[PDB]
Structures are given as C-alpha cells and as structure tokens.
C-alpha cells in the first residue's frame, strides 16, 4: 500500500500511532512524507532517526523547516528556542542524520500513479520538465560539500516570478521559495511571500497556487503539506493538502493512495 502523511514537525508519537493504525509494513508498503519533519514538536530527533531508517520504504521531500534546521546546523542561521531542535543538534549522530537529510529530494514523481509531491506544491508557472530541472539543481547544491553557501543564499523573498532566463542567486531563491514556501499567487502566477492565511481570509487578488490552472496539475495529482491554515480542505479534484496542523494541536493526516482513504491521528498536545 502507499501512504502519504503531511507535516510531522517533531510529532514522533503521533506519527508512530498513525502508522500503527494503518499497519504500515516496510517491504509491503511505501510512505510518502511532505517534509517539515522537524521543529515545534518535541521529537525531531526520533523522527529523523526513524525516517532515515526506512530507506527505500520512504519517499521524502524537504520542507522549509528542514532547510532551516540544516542552516542552523551549518552555523548559517540562529537557533530559535521555540523550534525545540537542540536535542537533535546535540545528538551524537547529528552529522549522520543531517548529512542524510540534505541529500533528500525536493520533488517526488511516480508516473504509474500519476502522482507528484513537493512540500508547498507545484507553481503553475512550471511544467513538469522545468520542475524536475529546478529540483535537480537545488538538490545538487544541497548535496555538495559547499551546501552552507547555498543555505545562506536561499533566504530572500525575490524574485517571485519565474523565467527560464533567471540566473544565479535569484534563480536558486525562486526555486527554493516555490518548492518550500509557496501558498498564494497573483493572477499571473507570481508568488506572494507574505500572506499565510486561509484562502477565504486572504486579501484580493491573491488566490491559492492550486486555483490557477497549471500544466503539471492538469496531468498529475499533486500532494503537498506546508499550508497549515488551509486545514487540508478547499482543494480541487486531484490536489491533496495533507498538512492538518498536528504540531499546532490539530491532527496528523494519512492518505492511502489505492483507495483514497484518510486516517487521522489527533494531536497529543
Ligand atoms: O493552523 C494554523 C497554523 C499556522 N498558522 C500560522 O501560519 C504560520 C505558518 O505555520 P505553518 O504550519 O502553516 O507553515 P510552516 O512552514 O511550518 O512555518 P512558516 O515558516 O511560517 O512558513 P513559510 O516559510 O512562511 O512558508 C505560523 O507561524 C502561524 O502563525 C495559522 O495561522 N493557522
Ligand atoms: Mn510545516
Ligand atoms: Mn512548511
């Protein structure tokens, strides 16, 4: 079976309880995770140890909090106490865990399922070939010995409009924001990097990225996490918003792909 779970955010106990509910069995089943494995919840260390141990039985994409953790580890960014990352950062296997994390994808594609997953979704300004090329480019910098330089460059809100002519810092920053920070778009597809509200509460003319027809979403289903104020609802057919805010006192959501059946684990906090 194929299971897709939204943002875990250190909620190890809820993750394991949900996997036990569906009797997740590596070797018979595969788990897809939308990223943001870490921060806010108490168990980021246990989450990373477990997910790394799954190997080929898990298909992860990196989220914005996973990248922030890497930046803290590399000394690029300051540790925020509310993220509760210190047990992971101080663990004796922190190097092993975080060198594994930075080699994971930003984009997962399964052609037989016609299924795409990224942390924030797929901007409507991208076709599939462009999304693949951009994912490959940023995965290459994150997996290289020089990844702290890119982590430092990644911060920023501009440019917010895609062009194949984009180069350099702006190109990488756009790619990172599209895959890991996107929520709202302007009508032409341009990213808005400020509004984090639910679609009903957003100022006009902002609309969800998935409300703008794009070439990937016309051919593939898209699963994503990230947008907790969406509460996993309000999406079109073929769009699966899996982040139901477990670390915020909401729920952890698991979707089984074969029958589109949902399973929910209440937050323990
Ligand atoms: O039910 C909710 C949950 C959260 N929020 C607010 O939205 C912000 C993002 O949290 P969130 O989980 O929705 O997304 P995260 O990726 O985990 O964190 P983020 O760094 O704020 O993302 P961006 O990088 O800006 O993209 C949070 O600070 C809260 O103030 C709500 O209003 N209602
Ligand atoms: Mn998140
Ligand atoms: Mn996120």
Secondary-structure topology with pairs:
Elements: E1 2-5, H1 12-21, E2 30-33, H2 44-54, E3 58-60, H3 64-73, H4 86-89, H5 94-101, E4 107-110, E5 115-118, H6 128-143, H7 147-153, H8 168-180, E6 184-185, E7 207-208, H9 215-219, E8 221-224, E9 239-241, E10 251-256, E11 261-266
Parallel strand pairs: 1-2, 2-3, 5-8, 8-9
Antiparallel strand pairs: 1-10, 4-5, 6-7, 10-11
Bound molecules: ligand A1CC9 and manganese (II) ion (2 copies).
Structural class: alpha/beta
Individual helix count: 9
Return the CATH class. Alpha Beta
Rg: 17 Å
How much strand content do the residues show?
Answer: 15-25%
Mind telling me the CATH superfamily name?
A: Metallo-dependent phosphatases
Number of strands: 11
User: Helix coverage percent of residues?
Assistant: 25-40%
What sequence of helices (H) and strands (E) makes up the elements? EHEHEHHHEEHHHEEHEEEE
The structural domain count equals: 1
PDB class: hydrolase
Keywords: ApaH, symmetrical hydrolase, RNA decapping, hydrolase
Assembly: monomeric
Entry title: Crystal structure of E. coli ApaH in complex with Up4U
Task: Describe this protein's structure.
The chain has 269 residues and is α/β, with parallel strands linked by helices. It has a single domain (2-266), classed as Purple Acid Phosphatase, chain A, domain 2 (4-Layer Sandwich), CATH 3.60.21. The chain is built from nine helices and eleven strands. It has helices at residues 12-21, 44-54, 64-73, 86-89, 94-101, 128-143, 147-153, 168-180, 215-219, and strands at 2-5, 30-33, 58-60, 107-110, 115-118, 184-185, 207-208, 221-224, 239-241, 251-256, 261-266. The chain has a five-stranded mixed beta sheet, with helices on one face. It has a four-stranded mixed beta sheet with strand order 4-5-8-9. Strands 6-7 form a two-stranded antiparallel ribbon. Helix 2 links the parallel strand 2 and strand 3. Helix 6 (128-143) crosses helix 8. The chain is globular and about 45 Å long. Residues 36, 63-65, 119, 226 line the site of one manganese (II) ion (MN). Pfam families: Metallophos. One of its GO terms (biological process) is nucleobase-containing small molecule interconversion. One of its GO terms (cellular component) is cytoplasm. Keywords: Hydrolase. Hydrolyzes diadenosine 5',5'''-P1,P4-tetraphosphate to yield ADP.
């Amino acid at each position: 079976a194929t299971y897709l779970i939204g943002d875990v955010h250190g909620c190890y106990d809820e993750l394991i309880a949900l996997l036990h509910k569906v009797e997740f069995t590596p070797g018979k089943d595969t788990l897809w995770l939308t990223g943001d494995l870490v921060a806010r919840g108490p168990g980021s260390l246990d989450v990373l140890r477990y997910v790394k141990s799954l190997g080929d039985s898990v298909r992860l994409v990196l989220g914005n909090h996973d990248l922030h953790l890497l930046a803290v580890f590399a000394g690029i960014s300051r540790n925020k106490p509310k993220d509760r990352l210190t047990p992971l950062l101080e663990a004796p296997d922190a190097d092993e865990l975080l060198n594994w994390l930075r080699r994971q994808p930003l984009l997962q594609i399964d052609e037989e399922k016609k299924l795409v997953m990224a942390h924030a979704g797929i901007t409507p300004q991208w076709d599939l070939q462009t999304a693949k090329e951009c994912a490959r480019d940023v995965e290459a910098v994150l997996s290289s010995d020089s990844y702290p330089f890119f982590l430092d460059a990644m911060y920023g809100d501009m440019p917010n409009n895609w062009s194949p002519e984009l180069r350099g810092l702006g190109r990488l920053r756009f790619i990172t924001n599209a895959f890991t920070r996107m929520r709202f778009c302007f009508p032409n597809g341009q990213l808005d990097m400020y509004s984090k509200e639910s679609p009903e509460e957003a100022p006009a003319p902002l609309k969800p990225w998935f409300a703008i027809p794009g070439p990937v979403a016309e051919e593939y289903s898209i699963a994503f996490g990230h947008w907790a104020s969406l509460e996993g609802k309000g999406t079109p057919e073929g769009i699966y918003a899996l982040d139901t805010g477990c670390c915020w006192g909401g729920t952890l959501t698991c979707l089984r792909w074969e029958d589109k059946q949902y399973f929910v684990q209440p937050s323990n906090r």
